[PDB]
């Protein structure tokens, strides 16, 4: 599955039998910032299709810094995922 030079790791199981689990894509161990963003009841998951991706290396703080992106997203009627160093109080409150 992962090629002869892929990454394989060993972890403790909680079951009687061993299992093989395949990880595709990108796992980076960060959760949702705000529970308000949840849109799927079964499992409390955020599921979106054809989303825009915003990558910010620095923390996102200002209303002036955030408004243009949300305006673009609403104009194009597409979901937006914001990956940023952090979200400050004002931006977080406005988003939620």
């Amino acid at each position: 599955k992962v090629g002869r030079k892929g990454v394989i790791t060993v972890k403790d199981g909680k079951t009687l039998n061993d299992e093989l689990e395949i990880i595709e894509g990108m796992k980076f161990d960060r959760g949702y910032i705000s529970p308000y963003f949840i849109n799927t009841s079964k499992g409390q998951k955020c599921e979106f299709q054809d989303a825009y991706v915003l990558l910010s290396e620095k923390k996102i703080s200002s209303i002036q810094s955030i408004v243009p992106a949300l305006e673009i997203a609403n104009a194009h009627r597409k979901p937006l995922v914001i990956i940023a160093e952090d979200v400050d109080g004002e931006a977080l409150s406005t988003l939620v």
Binding site: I63, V67, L70, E71, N74, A75, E90, S93, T94
Partner: protein, 100 residues
């Protein structure tokens, strides 16, 4: 001077009412009521009699009731009239006047 709601500013003091703050952007996004801070748009509601600072006879105030004005960010004294907010300025503090 011209009184407003049974109140008249004295000398060159000017009474104005600020307009309501913007609540929705040009799009469909409305803004939290904590972010607007203070708005500098106001309408003149009452006018004083004249400047005591002029030597000799006092000159009349340069603005009239009903004028629309741009206010400074730093002045103003809080007063309450029938639960609506008004601010008292001197003629010299008003940044600008609007005309139609």
């Amino acid at each position: 001077g011209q009184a407003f709601r049974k109140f008249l500013p004295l000398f060159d003091r000017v009474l104005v009412e600020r307009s309501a703050a913007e609540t929705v952007t040009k799009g469909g996004i409305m803004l939290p009521e904590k972010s607007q801070g203070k708005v500098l748009q106001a309408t003149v509601v009452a006018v004083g009699s004249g400047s005591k600072g002029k030597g000799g006879e006092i000159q009349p105030v340069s603005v009239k009731v009903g004028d629309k004005v741009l206010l400074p960010e730093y002045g103003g004294t809080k007063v309450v009239l029938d639960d609506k907010d008004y601010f008292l300025f001197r003629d010299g503090d008003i940044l600008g006047k609007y005309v139609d």
